[PDB]
Amino acid sequence: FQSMKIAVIGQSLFGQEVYCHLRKEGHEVVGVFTVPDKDGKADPLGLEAEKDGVPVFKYSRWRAKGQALPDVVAKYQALGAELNVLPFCSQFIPMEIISAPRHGSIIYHPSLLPRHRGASAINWTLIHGDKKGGFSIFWADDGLDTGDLLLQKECEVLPDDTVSTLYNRFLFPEGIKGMVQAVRLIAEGKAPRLPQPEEGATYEGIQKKETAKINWDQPAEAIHNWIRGNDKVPGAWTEACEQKLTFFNSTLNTSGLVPEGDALPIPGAHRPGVVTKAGLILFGNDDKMLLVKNIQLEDGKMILASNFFK
Ligand SMILES: Nc1nc2c(c(=O)[nH]1)N[C@@H](C=O)CN2
């Protein structure tokens, strides 16, 4: 064993939990780098670190005129970190920071690397209807999500899984355990390095609300995968009845359903939607059905799709 000085760079409840476990294991978290508020909620990793008197720093920022801000780097170097743990970072972290610690930097990534390198990997897993998923913890190198693996765990992906369900069922609870296990291996001097194969590598970038717009010119199954692969964040959407509607809780189980109800005209779609007591029936460009159970209105109100027209 060895108790280590660790810099934590991340966010969210996931980051908070990794932070708590590292401390429970006897490591010193020398600092936390997280996201700002927005709005006016503070990040829970930052709030937890602040409670404990651990240095907390908020970006981004991160960069200006090519290089890493001299300020952020300064704050980092004072900490004397021996390892960086990245439980949910976002932007490229300059190699002056990534490569500074004796033990380097390890990163949590919610896909089976080399598949779905880049941001929003859980979205892209489901958008493509992958039948298996999981997470990787990997050693940062100078590429984007190309570094050798430390460990990887797989799980089955179910036909109606969403980003949120797959995360809460597996990638969150097992991912936290996995990061903890990784730090233990590093502390013991027993951490593996498993180079990523070239075969099957794919890359996608961040999925912001704007690029979650539905393309209706696809089969029902692909549209279902698009909706669930953006559910709940950032939320797949379209224009209908003169507003922006976001669709959640899709299924391809349309057993016994008939397309009778109140039309929902959707510009660009192969057929109108139909609001039924079961929810919103939608058609793909193959005239096959999918069913959306919930709709978020442009003003943020969540409703049952069956209640759209009251
Ligand atoms: N140097 C480096 N920075 C990273 C990644 C990486 O692979 N290398 N991936 C993301 C980690 O959060 C974003 N930041």
Number of residues in the chain: 310
> DSSP character for 1?
-
Which CATH code fits 1-208?
A: 3.40.50.170
CA of 230 to the centre of ligand 1 (A): 22
Strand partners, 263: 274
Q: Which CATH class for the 209-310 domain? A: alpha beta
What pairs with residue 136 in β-bridges? Answer: 109, 152
Q: Which of 281, 282, 277 is nearest to 307 (CA)?
A: 277
Looking at residue 157, what DSSP letter applies? P
**Which H/E stretch holds residue 220?**
helix 220-228
270 is catalytic: no
From the number of C-beta atoms within 10 Å of its C-beta (0-12, 13-18, 19+), residue 89 rates as buried
Instruction: Work out the widest C-alpha separation in the chain, in whole angstroms.
Output: 66
Q: In the 8-state DSSP scheme, what is residue 52? A: T
Q: Are 289 and 283 contacting, i.e. CB atoms less than 8 angstroms apart?
A: yes
Q: Domain-by-domain residue ranges, the chain? A: 1-208, 209-310
3-state secondary structure of 48: helix
Binding-site residue numbers are 91-93, 145
Annotated binding residues for (6R)-10-formyltetrahydrofolate, written as ranges, equal 91-93, 145
Closest CA to 28 of 107, 82, 87, 109: 82
First-residue to last-residue Cα distance in the chain: 63
Classify 142 as helix, strand or coil: coil
Best mutation site among 9, 84, 93, 99 for ligand 1, i.e. most ligand atoms within 8 A of its Cβ?
93
Resolution limit, Å:
1.9
Plot region of 80 (φ>0 → left; ψ -120 to 50 → alpha; else → beta)? left
Instruction: Evaluate whether 109 touches 135 at the Cβ level (below 8 Å).
Output: yes
Which of 9, 73, 89 has most ligand 1 atoms within 8 Å of its beta carbon, as the pocket-test mutant? 89
DSSP output for 165-218: HHIIIIITHHHHHHHHHHHHHHHTT----BPPPSTT--B-----GGGGB---SS
- Distance separating alpha carbons of residues 72 and 51, to the nearest angstrom: 21
Experimental method: X-ray
CA distance 28 to 24: 9
